[PDB]
Structure 1
Amino acid sequence: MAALTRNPQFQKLLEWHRANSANLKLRELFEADPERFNNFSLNLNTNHGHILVDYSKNLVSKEVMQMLVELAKSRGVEAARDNMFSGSKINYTEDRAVLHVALRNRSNTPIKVDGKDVMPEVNRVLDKMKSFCQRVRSGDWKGYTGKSITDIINIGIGGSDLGPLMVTEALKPYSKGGPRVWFVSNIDGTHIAKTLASLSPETSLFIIASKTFTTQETITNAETAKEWFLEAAKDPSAVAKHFVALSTNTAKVKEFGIDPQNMFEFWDWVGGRYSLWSAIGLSIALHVGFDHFEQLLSGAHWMDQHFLKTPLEKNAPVLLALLGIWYINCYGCETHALLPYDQYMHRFAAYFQQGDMESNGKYITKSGARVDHQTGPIVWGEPGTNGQHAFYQLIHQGTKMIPCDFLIPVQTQHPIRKGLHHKILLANFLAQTEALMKGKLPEEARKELQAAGKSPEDLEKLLPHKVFEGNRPTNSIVFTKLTPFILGALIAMYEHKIFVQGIMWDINSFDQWGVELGKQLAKKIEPELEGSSAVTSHDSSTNGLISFIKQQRDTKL
C-alpha cells in the first residue's frame, strides 16, 4: 500500500467512519451541545482584523477531530512544516527548498539554503521593486515620447498570471493613484489582440513574467507585444522604457531588449503557484502601491507564524486540511467548493484551482509507491449570491456530497445605501449554510403546501420535491474586512492547508511533472499544421481532427 493507508491512526479513522458516520447528523450535533460553535471554531486576532474560521457545521464530533489531529501528528506534519520553514529541500523530486514563506518573512530571521541566508537577496529584490514602483507611480518613469505610464500589462501564464490577477482584482479599492493593470495569459491571439486594441504604445509598460523565461505562451505573447510596440516607436532602444522582466535569464532578457537593471529576480524555491509574494507580484505593487504590497506580505507572515507556532488542534490551516482529509479519504468527495460572498474575490476560486490542484493532483508517494487512496480534490466555485441562482440547486438537492467554504468580509468596501446591499449579502451568506445544514422537513413543507392552497392530490405529488435532506457540511470563514493584510493571511492559510494535506498523503505538493507530456506532444503537432499535406503520424482521432482543421480553415462564412 502507501504511507497513509498503512498508518494505524488512518485505519482507526476509516474504521470509525465505517461504523459511525451514518449516526452523524448536523441537526443533532448542534441540538446536543450548545457549546458546539464555541468548541468548533477559531477566532483569530491578527491585530489587523479578526479571522473567524467556523468549522462547526461539519460532520465531526470531538472524537473525530481528536482522531484527525492524531493522524496529522503521526503523518509527520509538525516535522515536515519545520523542514519547510528551515529551508530543507522538501521538494524531493527536484531537490529544491520550498520557501515562499521566506518571501514574506517580515521578521528577517535568517533562513538558510545551502548554508546561506536567503533574506538579503529577498530584501534586495523587494527594495528594487519599491524603487521601480516609485518611478512608475509618480510619473517619473517616462515612455519613449516622454509621457507618464498609464497602463501596466502583465504577460505570463499559470503561476505568472493567476496570483497577480486575483490579488489586483481583490484589492481594487486600494489602487487610487496607480496605473491601470491588464493581464495577458492565453496564447489565443484574442487575448493580446483585444488588450492592445485599447492601449497606446506611448504610455504602456509590459511586464514579462516567467520563472523559466521559456514558456512558449508567454514568450510568443511578449514578442507580439514588442512587434506592436516597435511599429509605433521605430527604435529598438525604446524597448527598455516599456518592457521589464520577472525572471533570471539575464542574457535572454538583454537579448529581448530589456535593460538588465529591469530584471526582477526570484529563485528556484519559489514555486510558480506560490510566487505572487516574490518579484512576480510586481504588477500588484505597481497597482496598489508598495506599502499595500508589504501589508499583503505581512498578512501572509502572520499566518505563517500562526501555522508554525500553534498546537495542531487549534491551528487554522491544519484543521481545514484535516476536514478535507475526512471528506476526501473517508467520505470520498471528489470536489471542494470555494464560495466567496465578495465580487472583488471573483478570481479566488480560479487561483486555488492551480494552488490546490497543481500541488496535490498527484499519485506517487515519497517512496515511489503509487497511492492506493485519493489525493487532491477538484476545486471550483463562483461568488455568492450568484451561485444560489446557478448551481446551489445541485448542492441542496443533488446526489453529490460537496464540502463548501463560504467566505465573507464583515465590512464592505462599498457600503452603499446605508449598508443595505451588504446587509442582504450577509443575510444570504448566513442563511445558505444554515439551510444546507438544516434542510426542510416534510412537516414543514407540508404546511407550506397546505397554506398555498394546493389540493390534497397536488400536495401529495409536490411534497417530496419540496423537502431538503440537509446535512450538507460547510465551513464559514468570516473576516473583519478584505484589506491587503487580511487577504494575505487568507491566501497563506490555504497555502498551508494544501501543504498539510500533501504531507499526509505522502506526495510532493511542490513539483508538477504532469505538464510534460502535453508539452511534448504539442511541439510535435505544431509544424504539422502548416501546409495542406495530410497528417498520418498520430492516432486516427488526432489525425482526423487535424484533417478537419486543414479542410475547414479556408472556408468563407
Structure 2
Amino acid sequence: PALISDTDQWKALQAHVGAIHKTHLRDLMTDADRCKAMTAEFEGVFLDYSRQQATTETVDKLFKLAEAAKLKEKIDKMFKGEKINTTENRSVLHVALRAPRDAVINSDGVNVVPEVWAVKDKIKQFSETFRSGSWVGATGKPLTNVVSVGIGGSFLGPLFVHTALQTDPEAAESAKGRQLRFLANVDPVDVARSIKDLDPATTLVVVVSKTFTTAETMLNARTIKEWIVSSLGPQAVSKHMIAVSTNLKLVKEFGIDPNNAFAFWDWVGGRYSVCSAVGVLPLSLQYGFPIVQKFLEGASSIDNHFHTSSFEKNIPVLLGLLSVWNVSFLGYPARAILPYSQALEKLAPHIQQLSMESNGKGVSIDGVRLPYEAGEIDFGEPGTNGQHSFYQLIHQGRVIPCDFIGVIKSQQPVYLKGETVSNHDELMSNFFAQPDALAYGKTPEQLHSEKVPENLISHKTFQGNRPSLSFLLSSLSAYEIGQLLSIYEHRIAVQGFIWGINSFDQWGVELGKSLASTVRKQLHASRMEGKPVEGFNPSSASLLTRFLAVKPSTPYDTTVLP
C-alpha cells in the first residue's frame, strides 16, 4: 500500500542524513568498536563495511525501515514459492534450482524440486556421455568445442562463471583441451568470432533461450545450424545441436531432438538462471558436473544464510540496505563493482543486468509512480585495471560508492626470487590501500606540511569521506563463485523489496522490440522489394535512407557465411 517514502522510518533516515553529513570517515575509522560492529561473516566470506558513511545508529535506523517495509516476510514469501512477481503472476524461485534433493518448494501447488533435480541428473548423464567421447559427430569424431547461443540472462551469467572457473586449478584441469564460447550478439561479426578456428565435426551447439523466440538468439541459432549443414549435411543437426528452454514444443519445431532438450521454468528469471540448465548444462560439458555441483552448493549455502540469518549477521540484507542508504538517502546515482581478480573480469557485466534490469523501474509493484529514483547505475572493471582507468574520478570527481572484492588464496600464485612481494601480494596491496585512500583523503594542510607548492595543493587535495565496502573471500573456486553469485542475486532483491518495486519483471524492453520489428519490415521491403522508406520521422527516414543507399554485394536471396 503506502509508498515507502511516506513512512516515518523513511523520513527518519532523511533526518539522519544531516547528522552523518557532520561526520568524516578519517575520524570514524579510528573507532575500534564502530568498525568491528560494521562487519559480518559467513564461512569463507568476510564483509567489512566500516567505510560506509554510517554509524551503528544508521544501521539501526535502516533496520526499522526494513521492518516497516516487511523485508523478512517478502523474503520468506519468495522462498515459499508464492507468486510475488505479481505483474507476470509468477513464482520467483531461482533458489529452488540449487535446493537440496529433499527440499519441498511448491509452485502452483506442486513441489518443483524433483523436476529441478530431474534436469540436473539428465545433464549429468549427458555430460558424462559427452566428455567421455561416446557422443560423436557426423564424421565420427568426438565433440570438444561447445558454442552456447543465447543473450541476456542466457549469456552474462554463464559467461561470468566460466571466466571465474577458467583459471581455478581444479576446474581448469577438468576442462583440459575443451573450449566454451558464447555466441550472443546478432551482429554477424560475433558469429564469425564464435566459429573461428572451429570444426563443425568437433563442435557441439547449445541454444539457450527461455522463450526460443528471442530474435537475436533464433537467428544465431539458424545461422550456426546452417554452418553445420554446409559442412556436415542435413542430418548432422541432431548430433551437433541441443537446447535449453522453457518451451520444448518450439525446440522440437527448430529441428532438435526432444530428448536433447533441457528444460527450465518460467519462475526462473533470466538474470537469475545460471543455476538452472542455462548454466549447468554448458558448464558441465566444460568442467564436468562435479565442479558445477560445487558451484550450486555454494549458492545453496548463501540461500540458507539469507533466509535464516538475523539482519545484523545477514550479508545480503546488509549489502542491500547499505545500497539503499547510498542511493536513496545520500543520493549516489552510480555504484562501482571493483573486484581485485581478473578471474572476476566478467562479474561487473553480469551484475549490470542483474541490478539494472531488476531495479531500473519507475513505479511501485502496485503501479504507483515512484516519487524517487530506484535502481543504481552499475559499472566496473577488475582491479588493478580500473585503478588506472577511472579511479581518478572516484577520488576527486563524482562520489561513487564501491564494492571491493579481494581473495586471499590466489588461483595462480606467482613469485620471483628476490621480489619484495609475490605477484598476488602486489595485487592485494592496492585492495587494502584504495578503500582507506577513499576514506581518509589528504588535506591541504597535510599537503602544505609536505611543502607542496601552494598553486598545486588545490589540485592535490583529496576530500576523502568517500564510501566503500570490502569483501574478503577465502578462495575463488566453484563453491565460492556460487556464494558470490548468490550474494548479489539476494542483494538486488533486497533493494527491490525495500524500494517496494517488482525486481523480477522487465516491461521496459518491450517497446524497443516493437519498433525494431517495424524497422525490420521496412528493411525487408526495401532490400527485397525496392519499396521506399515510409512511416518514419524525418531523422529516422534519413538514417534509413543512408543505410539502404548501400546496396548489398551478394546475388539476390543467396546464402553467405564468413
Which category of TM-score, normalised to the shorter sequence, fits these structures? over 0.9
Is the alpha carbon distance of 1:35 and 1:21 closer, same or farther for their aligned partners in structure 2, counting shifts above 3 Å?
closer
Alpha carbons of structure 1 residues 447 and 345: separation in structure 2 relative to 1, 3 Å: same
Pair 229,388 (structure 1): closer, same or farther in 2 beyond 3 Å: same
Partner of 2:214: 215
Letter in 1 for 2:10: F
Does 2:496 correspond to 1:502?
yes
| Corresponding position: 1:27 with 2:21 | no
Aligned to 2:207, the other structure's residue is in SS state strand
1:353-383 Cα offsets, whole Å, 9 max, x none, are 0001000111111221101112110110000
Conservation of the 8 A alpha-carbon contact between 1:2 and 1:369: no
Aligned residue among 144, 151, 155 for 2:145 = 151
Aligned 1:21-420 pairs, distance under 5 A = 21-31=20-30, 33-45=31-43, 50-106=44-100, 108-172=102-166, 173=168, 174-178=171-175, 179-234=178-233, 236-281=234-279, 282-398=281-397, 400-417=398-415, 420=422
Cα distance, 1:554 vs. partner? 6.4
Query: 1:440 matched to which residue of 2?
Result: 442
Instruction: Give the 3-state SS of the residue equivalent to 2:4 in structure 1.
Output: coil
- 1:402-481, aligned counterparts within 5 Å? 402-417=400-415, 420-449=422-451, 459-481=453-475
Deviation at 1:474, TM superposition (A): 0.2
Structure 1 residue 312, shift from structure 2 partner = 1.3
Q: Would you say the 8 A contact 1:152–1:205 is kept in 2?
A: yes
Alignment partners' CA distance in 1, 2:319 and 2:376: 13
| TM-score of the two chains, using structure 2 as the length reference | 0.94
Whichever residue aligns with residue 522 of structure 2, its letter is E
Task: Return the letter of the residue paired with 2:259.
Answer: Q
Which residue of the partner structure matches residue 538 of structure 1?
536
Contact 1:175-1:287 within 8 A present in 2 as well: no
| Contact kept? 1:437, 1:472, Cα under 8 Å | yes
Bigger shift: residues 473-482 or 98-107? 98-107
Tell whether the 8 Å contact from 1:137 to 1:177 is kept in structure 2 after alignment.
no
Aligned partners of 1:270 and 1:550: how far apart in 2?
A: 40
SS of residue paired to 2:513: helix
Conserved 8 A contact 1:339-1:405: yes
Shift of 1:23: 1.0
| SS of the residue 1:417 aligns to | coil
Shift of 1:384: 0.5
**Superposition RMSD in Å:** 1.5
Specify the code of the residue in structure 2 equivalent to 1:298.
E
Amino acid in the other structure paired with 1:326: W
Aligned residue for 2:343, secondary structure, equals helix
SS at match of 1:362: coil
Other structure's SS at 1:382 match: coil
Q: Alpha-carbon deviations, 1:253-310, whole Å to 9, x = none?
A: 2232211111000011001000000010111121121111111111111101111111
After superposing the two structures, state which structure 1 stretch, 1-10 or 268-277, moved more. 1-10
Output the CA distance in 1 between the equivalents of 2:471 and 2:323: 15
Change (3 A) 1:107 1:442: farther
CA distance in structure 1 between the aligned counterparts of 2:451 and 2:146, rounded to whole angstroms = 58
What amino acid sits opposite 1:339 in the alignment? Answer: L
SS of structure 2 residue aligned to 1:246: strand
Contact 2:316 2:487 in 1 (8 A): yes
Structure 2 CA distance for aligned equivalents of residues 284 and 447 of structure 1: 56
- Cα distance in structure 1, aligned partners of 2:375 and 2:432: 28
Out of 530, 549, 553, which is 1:551 matched to? 549
- Matched residue type, 1:241: K
CA distance in 1, matches of 2:318, 2:52: 11
Unaligned runs of 5+ in 2: 554-562
The answer (yes or no) to whether the contact 2:40–2:312 under 8 Å persists in 1 is no
2:509 to 498, 505, 515: 515
Distance 2:45 2:508 in 1: 35
Gaps of 5+ in 1: 451-458
Q: Which residue of 2 aligns with 1:9?
A: 9
In 2, distance between residues paired with 1:395 and 1:383? Answer: 15
Asked if structure 2 preserves the Cα contact closer than 8 Å seen for 1:365 and 1:371, the reply is yes
Displacement after TM superposition at 1:135 (Å): 1.1
d(CA) in 2 for partners of 1:407, 1:423: 14
**What is the CA distance between 1:245 and its match in structure 2?**
0.5
CA contact (8 A) 1:2 1:372 kept: no
| Matching residue of 1:454 | none
Distance 1:366 1:170 in 2: 35
CA displacement, residues 124-179 of structure 1 (integer Å, 9 cap, x when unaligned): 10000111110111111111111111100000000111111110011113132432
Q: Give SS of 2:235's match.
A: helix
Inter-partner Cα distance in structure 1 for 2:306 and 2:23: 29
Deviations 1:201-233 (A, max 9, x none): 100000000000000100100100011100111
Number of residue pairs aligned between Structure 1 and Structure 2 = 539
Provide TM-score, normalisation by structure 1.
Answer: 0.94
Do the aligned partners of residues 183 and 10 (structure 1) sit closer, same or farther apart at CA in structure 2, a change above 3 Å counting?
Answer: same
Aligned residue for 1:5, secondary structure, equals helix
**Could you say what secondary structure the match of 2:41 adopts?**
strand
**What code does the residue aligned with 1:4 have?**
I
Aligned partner of 1:453 in structure 2 is: none
Q: Give the 3-state SS of the residue equivalent to 1:9 in structure 2.
A: helix
Per-residue deviation at 1:543?
A: 1.2
Q: Which secondary structure state, in structure 2, belongs to the residue aligned with residue 549 of structure 1?
A: helix
The 3-state SS of whatever aligns with 2:480 is helix
- 1:379 maps to a residue whose letter is D
How far the C-alpha of 1:544 sits from its partner, in A, is 1.7
SS of equivalent to 1:314: coil
The aligned amino acid for 1:438 is Y
Cα deviation for residue 539 of structure 1 reads: 1.6
- Whole-angstrom distance in 2 between the partners of 1:113 and 1:251: 22
SS of match in other structure, 2:290 = helix
3-state SS of 2:263 partner:
coil
